[PDB]
Design a protein around this ligand. Structure first.
Ligand SMILES: [Zn+2]
Lengths: 549, 195, 190, 245, 101
């Protein structure tokens, strides 16, 4: 590894020696837009560098074209550069035509790349001195064999060693993309090693960790005890600030919407009870009647909801959920209270942030969309501070609206049975429908796909197949295709979790595009999301059917 | 009996004098600006009351008609505290302050009202179809006897009193009292119809 | 400075600046004693205090320098004597018992309070909310006394012994104009 | 001024002069020597900060060497530059206020200047650039108003400096405006050798002033804020005896 | 700053009379001349809000290239945030190229 866990501080010191100045901006940070963990890490770094009065600039970027153009724009004055949320999986030097002899003097510049994706470019570490990254503890133990082959490959019977090295490199490659650690977690480890921990840093670390609950529950479960222990280690006065471990549930905005809607819109409850048809609603009404909460009482705001039932809700759930089999909905979460404002949970706050990112405020229209996205990112960033709450109530109401729209589209999809079951991978295309303009956002498409894959997993089928989802943008006449990984049921043991399910869609797309002159545009930081032509979708599809996945 | 009333009044006065968000005591400034313009009233939002402490809201929702007057007299006590000087010891033309509430609870249709909504706080919407003419109501009654012929005063609240039996201590009648209309305080009441 | 009518009175930012250009006490966290190193050599403040400074000792600096050192970890501001509950209690008792005289308070009243409450939060020995409420009560009663005293507006003169800068500033454009109008009426009538 | 006790005394005098000028209803004279010292001080301060910045920059960019130690390096330079910025702001505000006042009373000042009997001359009250400003502004405004309106105006009243008829065009300053004062007393530490102050019961030395129009006598004790007209208090202001707020 | 800002206030300033326009031009000339005398080291046309803080956060409003500063360069990438000195961006803020003081 380049920078181990114990070396962070040392590297940090170097930054000061190259950036701490009186009247010169010598530090620029590029952030992976449309990502919560990157936003939390950027906030923590901004606070850190505002403490010691180190001048800096924050620049959001969306695509690799923007990254290349912005790097080409930069001047030689910038000694230190930060790249948070991307860059691990590709070789920057080849992309950025970096000449080490041009930057020898050594260490003319410094580029610190900080990413969480686990399959990363081996040459980027073992070949280059200018580029350096913060390892999470993977190179030391996992790559004890690949490095030997790379070092050896960097009298006629000696070709056996070359063949073995080539085979080892090939075996290391052709692996799916996954995430195994958190950027905010690494930054908080650095902060704990330095000695600048406090409540704001703990809150941001909690947000960054809990942003992965939907997709990387294994990482979340591996990392949770550290957060619990750290929170334990660290009169209602109008200036109090409380962080506690309160029971919480897999519910959609429980403390801001009625309990009926909370049960209605919850993805896990939907998957377990089939609420898209009438039998689901009948079962929900049976549930409510047997618990004993009146239907008129359960349809009121959580503030005015009955105090006694609010107190005994835990016992009611414990005694009633076993028959319906929802006993996996109860978990432990973090709750933050400040004075007389109210109570917010981490899940609710991250859903509000995600929805505020989603909604707020040919090539030219694509550029306009991308600048709208970066403006939404900045507005979401501004919403972080405690002095603004009209930028969070709006986010909560927009989250409610977006979840309603997603539910309305998913029920129609499941009615129409558009999910075609092929031999290898499932496929569905949203050819026509209402409010299809909302799905031009990749994060909204991922939300819809997450709900669909949860619904598919919560069935009796014994086939784990990748799912392909596509949409339409009639103005551009292009399909937005995103590949989705299969997921195990949330109520499963750890023995069948030897390795998380990988994603081969990026490899398949790149191979097809490199062997066939298709009219696509692969520039998103997510390598499994592409834009394809309406006329070019199908042939491409058959190609993907005929290619080794 | 009187101890509980004093405790409730103290709780509401502490709520008024201690509630602050960021760097502003909103309700005290509201009282100031209301007294300056001669609008003896105060507006309370449910969310602030619940966030401050839940027991006060629970008691208000339990028996509203008995608890509201205590709050409306705590308001005028605070107003007299923060509007006039003791001067080491006058007009004092400050009547009992009016309390106005706002809420965002679930609405209840008119036809849904039934026996379980008796003596409860409800929110509902309709259309006004007719307004009655305003009438007078008594609040501070100066009462004179006829045989013993002494003076007494009666204070009347509007929520939820008759001529006292026997005289105050010779051998008067059952209710030998009359109403002195001068030196009496009156307010306005109006009737409305909702559809 | 013209800006319409901003040439006649002081804006609140100017009041904050003129108040923060005042001495204050400080407990430094570092040492800068000369070797027996760059000279401060400032022009509008004595350097000998700053240069000949040793840690954990009392010294006097201007308020803005104290705030600048407080932004880093190089400072620990000492709160004044009048910012404590036991002093404000006797003060408020003095206003309550005397219904005609304004109590003696520094002319930086409410302003040093605002600055210290905004910046120097973790160095107070008393809870912040209690002090803020007591200061609010003081402001309330002084406002009542000012409103009561404003009724007499002679055309000759007036006396206001112990009013702070903000209280005079927010009342100047009204009292001045009313008295000027009265003077004009009287002079035109003779 | 004739000599300096300390530059901080000059700063205090400048601040007091600015405060007096901002609220006074009449244009006051010009303290030439104070700003003559202050501008030169600013010149040396800027020169030295630039020299030291050049020195550190050359030391850092001649070779790798050793980067400057963060301690006792950034904070002093920050303090000097921010102090210079604040002083520049104060000077700028004072100059702009004086420019606004000179713009207001241009015609009255010009009429006063040509009077030989007036012991007050334009040279004392103004800096040279202000004299040039007044001259050019008056000339251009007169040319504009003559080209716009007065060319069609009858000759008998074409003059804009007319003081006869119904209404006069000369804008005299209002000497009777009410101002807020703080009785500073004598500037000396003894504060008791002044030949004007008197005594009341319980000591409390006071200054006695009279209002010619109202036929009254008003006591002005030390340490009390008053609300008094400006005409009767010009001398005490000019003697640094009272300070306007 | 005595420039009349023809690059950005009414655009063509044609609602003024020609005499008023030449008066405006000569007044701009006078303002430029005035600060060329003994006050060359002070910018009179600067801000009049007293300097309260030394380091502030500022957000870009319009896109441009990179601008040279003293010992540094500021690349005005569209919609970015700077944590820079207060005494370095007042000119840009007055011009309207920056936001969120
Ligand atoms: Zn009787």
């Amino acid at each position: 590894m380049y920078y181990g866990i114990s070396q962070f501080s040392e590297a940090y010191n170097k930054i000061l020696r190259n950036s701490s100045s009186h009247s010169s901006c010598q530090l620029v940070i590029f952030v992976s837009c449309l990502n919560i963990d990157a936003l939390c890490a950027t906030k923590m770094l901004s606070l850190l560098f505002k403490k010691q009065l180190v001048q800096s600039q924050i620049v959001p970027i969306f695509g690799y074209s923007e990254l290349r153009r912005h790097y080409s724009q930069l001047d030689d004055n910038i000694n230190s550069l930060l790249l948070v949320g991307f860059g691990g999986v590709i070789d920057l030097e080849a992309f950025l035509e970096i000449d080490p002899q041009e930057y020898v003097i050594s260490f003319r510049r410094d580029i610190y790349v900080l990413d969480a994706h686990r399959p990363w470019n081996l040459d980027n570490i073992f070949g280059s001195q200018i580029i350096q990254c913060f390892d999470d503890g993977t190179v030391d133990d996992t790559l004890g064999e690949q490095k030997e082959a790379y070092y050896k490959l960097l009298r006629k019977q000696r070709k056996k060693q070359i063949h073995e090295y080539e085979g080892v490199l090939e075996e290391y490659y052709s692996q799916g993309t996954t995430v195994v650690n958190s950027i905010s977690a690494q930054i908080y480890s650095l902060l704990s090693a330095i000695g600048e921990t406090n409540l704001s840093n703990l809150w941001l670390n909690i947000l960054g960790t809990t942003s992965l609950d939907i997709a990387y529950a294994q990482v979340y479960n591996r990392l949770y005890p550290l957060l619990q222990d750290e929170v334990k280690r660290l009169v209602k006065t109008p200036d109090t600030l409380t962080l506690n471990i309160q029971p919480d549930y897999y519910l959609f905005l429980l403390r801001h919407s009625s309990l009926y809607d909370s049960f209605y819109y919850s993805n896990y409850v939907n998957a377990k009870l089939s609420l898209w048809n009438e039998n689901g609603k009948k079962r929900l009404h049976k549930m409510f009647a047997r618990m004993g909460i009146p239907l008129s009482t359960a349809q009121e705001t959580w503030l005015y909801m009955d105090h006694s039932i609010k107190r005994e809700l835990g016992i009611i759930f414990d005694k009633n959920l076993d028959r319906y089999g929802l006993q996996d909905i109860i978990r432990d979460g973090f709750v933050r209270t400040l004075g007389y404002r109210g109570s917010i949970s981490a899940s609710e706050f991250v859903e509000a942030l995600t929805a505020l990112l989603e909604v707020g405020n040919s090539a030219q229209k694509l550029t306009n969309l991308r600048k709208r996205w970066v403006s939404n990112f900045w507005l979401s960033w501004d919403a972080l501070d405690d002095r603004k709450v009209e930028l969070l109530n709006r986010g909560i109401q927009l989250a409610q609206d977006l979840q309603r729209a997603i539910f309305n589209t998913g029920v129609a999809i499941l009615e129409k049975k558009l999910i075609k079951h092929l031999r290898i991978y499932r496929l569905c295309v949203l050819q026509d429908g209402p409010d299809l303009d909302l799905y031009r956002n990749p994060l909204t498409l991922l939300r819809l796909g997450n709900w669909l894959i949860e619904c598919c997993a919560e069935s009796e089928d014994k086939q784990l197949l990748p799912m392909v989802l596509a949409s339409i943008d009639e103005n551009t006449d292009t399909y937005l295709v995103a590949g989705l990984t299969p997921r195990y049921p949330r109520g499963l043991d750890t023995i069948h979790t030897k390795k998380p399910i990988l994603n081969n869609f990026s490899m398949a797309f790149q191979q097809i595009t490199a062997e066939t002159d298709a009219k696509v545009r692969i520039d998103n930081f997510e390598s499994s999301i592409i834009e394809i032509r309406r006329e070019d979708l199908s042939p491409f599809l058959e190609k993907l059917t005929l290619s080794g996945l | 009996n009187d101890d509980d009333n004093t405790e409730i009044i103290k709780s509401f006065k502490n709520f008024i004098l201690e509630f602050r968000l960021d760097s502003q005591f909103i309700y005290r400034d509201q009282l100031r600006n209301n007294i300056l313009v001669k609008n003896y009233s105060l507006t309370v939002n449910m969310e602030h009351l619940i966030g401050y402490n839940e027991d006060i809201y629970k008691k208000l929702s339990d028996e509203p008609s008995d608890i509201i007057p205590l709050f409306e007299t705590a308001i005028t006590q605070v107003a007299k505290r923060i509007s006039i000087l003791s001067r080491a010891q006058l007009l004092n033309s400050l009547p009992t302050f009016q309390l106005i509430l706002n809420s965002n609870a679930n609405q209840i249709p008119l036809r849904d009202l039934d026996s379980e909504h008796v003596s409860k706080i409800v929110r509902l919407s309709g259309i006004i179809i007719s307004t009655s003419v305003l009438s007078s109501r008594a609040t501070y009654l100066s009462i004179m006897c006829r045989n013993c012929r002494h003076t007494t005063s009666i204070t009347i609240n509007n929520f939820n009193v008759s001529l006292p039996r026997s005289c105050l201590s010779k051998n008067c009648g059952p209710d030998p009292y009359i109403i002195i209309h001068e030196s009496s305080k009156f307010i306005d009441q109006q009737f409305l119809k909702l559809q | 400075s013209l800006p319409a009518h901003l040439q006649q009175t002081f804006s609140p930012e100017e009041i904050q600046f003129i108040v923060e250009n005042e001495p204050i006490k400080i407990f430094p966290r570092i040492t800068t004693r000369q070797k027996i190193h760059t000279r401060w050599q400032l022009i509008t403040t004595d350097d000998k205090a700053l240069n000949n400074m040793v840690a954990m000792r009392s010294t006097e600096v201007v308020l803005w320098i104290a705030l600048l050192l407080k932004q880093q970890s190089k400072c620990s501001i000492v709160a004044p004597q009048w910012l404590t509950t036991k002093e404000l209690d006797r003060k408020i008792q003095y206003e309550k018992t005397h219904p005609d005289r304004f109590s003696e308070l520094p002319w930086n009243w409410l302003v040093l309070a605002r600055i210290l409450f905004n910046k120097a939060k973790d160095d107070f020995h008393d809870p912040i909310h209690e002090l803020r409420g007591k200061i609010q009560d003081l402001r309330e009663i002084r406002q009542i006394k000012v409103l009561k005293g404003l009724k007499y507006l002679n055309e000759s003169h007036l006396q206001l012994d112990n009013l702070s800068l903000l209280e005079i500033n927010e009342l100047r454009p009204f009292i001045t104009e009313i008295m000027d109008k009265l003077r004009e009426i009287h002079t035109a009538s003779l | 001024t004739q000599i300096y006790v300390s530059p901080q005394q000059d700063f205090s005098d400048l601040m007091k002069s600015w405060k007096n000028e901002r609220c006074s209803p009449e244009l006051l004279p010009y303290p030439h020597q104070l700003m003559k010292r202050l501008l030169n001080r600013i010149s040396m301060q800027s020169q030295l900060i630039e020299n030291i910045s050049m020195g550190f920059l050359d030391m850092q960019n001649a070779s790798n060497a050793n980067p400057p130690m963060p301690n006792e390096s950034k904070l002093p330079l920050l303090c000097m530059e921010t102090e210079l910025e604040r002083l520049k702001f104060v000077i700028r505000s004072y100059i702009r206020c004086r420019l606004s006042k000179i713009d207001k009373f241009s015609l009255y000042l010009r009429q006063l200047n040509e009077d030989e009997n007036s012991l007050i001359s334009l040279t004392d009250l103004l800096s040279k650039d202000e004299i040039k400003y007044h001259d050019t502004h008056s000339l251009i405004w007169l040319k504009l108003v003559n080209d716009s309106i007065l060319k069609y105006m009858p000759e008998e009243l074409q003059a804009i400096n007319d003081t006869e008829g119904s209404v006069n065009m000369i804008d005299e300053p209002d000497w009777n405006k009410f101002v807020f004062i703080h009785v500073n007393g004598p500037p000396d530490g003894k504060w008791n050798e002044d030949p004007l102050l008197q005594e009341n019961e319980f000591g409390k030395p006071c200054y006695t002033v009279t209002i010619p129009d109202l036929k009254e006598e008003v006591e002005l004790t030390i340490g009390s804020i008053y609300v008094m007209r400006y005409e009767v208090i010009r001398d005490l202001l000019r003697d640094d005896k009272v300070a306007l707020i | 700053n005595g420039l009349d800002l023809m690059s950005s206030s009414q655009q063509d300033t044609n609602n003024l009379s020609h005499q008023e326009q030449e008066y405006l031009k000569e007044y701009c000339d006078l303002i430029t001349d005035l600060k060329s005398g003994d006050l060359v080291d002070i910018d009179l046309s600067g801000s009049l809000v007293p300097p309260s803080d030394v380091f502030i956060d500022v957000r870009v409003l319009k896109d441009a290239g990179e601008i040279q500063t003293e010992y540094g360069v500021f690349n005005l990438i569209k919609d970015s945030q700077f944590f820079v000195r207060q005494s370095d961006v007042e000119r840009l803020i007055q011009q309207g190229y920056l936001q969120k003081i």
